[PDB]
Symmetry: C3
Subunit: 122 residues, 3 copies
Amino acid sequence: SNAMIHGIGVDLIEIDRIQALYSKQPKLVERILTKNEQHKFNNFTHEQRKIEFLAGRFATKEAFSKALGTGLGKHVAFNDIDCYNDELGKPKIDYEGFIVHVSISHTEHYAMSQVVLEKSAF
Amino acid sequence: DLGTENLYFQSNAMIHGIGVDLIEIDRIQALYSKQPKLVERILTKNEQHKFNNFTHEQRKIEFLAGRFATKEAFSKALGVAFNDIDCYNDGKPKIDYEGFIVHVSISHTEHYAMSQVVLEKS
Amino acid sequence: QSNAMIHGIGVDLIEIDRIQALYSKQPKLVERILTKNEQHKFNNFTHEQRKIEFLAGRFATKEAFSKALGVAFNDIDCYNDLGKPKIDYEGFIVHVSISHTEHYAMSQVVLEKSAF
């Protein structure tokens, strides 16, 4: 554990899969998003923006899990990873022991997210 | 120290920021075909020279789409006009930006272009 | 050289259909792409769509690694440790991540410089 980066993660998600499931099970939102993220999700005036936000959050959490190492990451509830936005709108995640770097991108049909977990200490 | 909230000043991070961008090539094609002059707002002179010398139209649009994704990913990692961001090739893509070490990678498929950027402070 | 912590990064996005076509047409190319270890996993998949998916992810990983480095594809052994994908290459700490959807596979690689 001499490396300064603990791990990296990336996840690509088809918007139509998220849309399908949200339509088939609206309580999907409560299973992926924190209360804070739900507040945001419910505040979007446009349904397509809601689905994009949800897809981006799902991809981000999957990327975060992959950066941790799936063997550990699968034990972290989505509800416990709060991806919030700073004052410039940049996505952020706080997680003790790391400096978490996140980036999200959207097209009409896909959402993707990248996470790099930098170690906070030597 | 000094009692400032300035994030850059206080930061102990090795990575300054990361950025990813996914672009649908069809959108770039549409944009170019119905507004060719915007290429002057996206590409530097050297990039335009290269853009203009492509013999095949599809490779021309791919180059543009890849540069658009790169400038967006760079912009997101930095936290600067696109036509002042010169992404050149060693054939590795690279961006020189005073004060930083800029790491870039670009990938293309038939329908999508993507780029990722990681910035370290010098 | 440089005082940089990172040597290079790479990303590759690949259309699954293209890999499907490659395997259908020229199944012998797999031995030029996959290491013997990877071929073992590949051969062990009982579901056709999941083995093409595995192949596509490994092709993207080799492409991404190659781009980050700036080595033969079948000499780049990507194995799983907690299930995290890993590649050993002397001089670096190789960070890798792979993602799949129905139609695309992608991989990203960050080559961190080792303070030996």
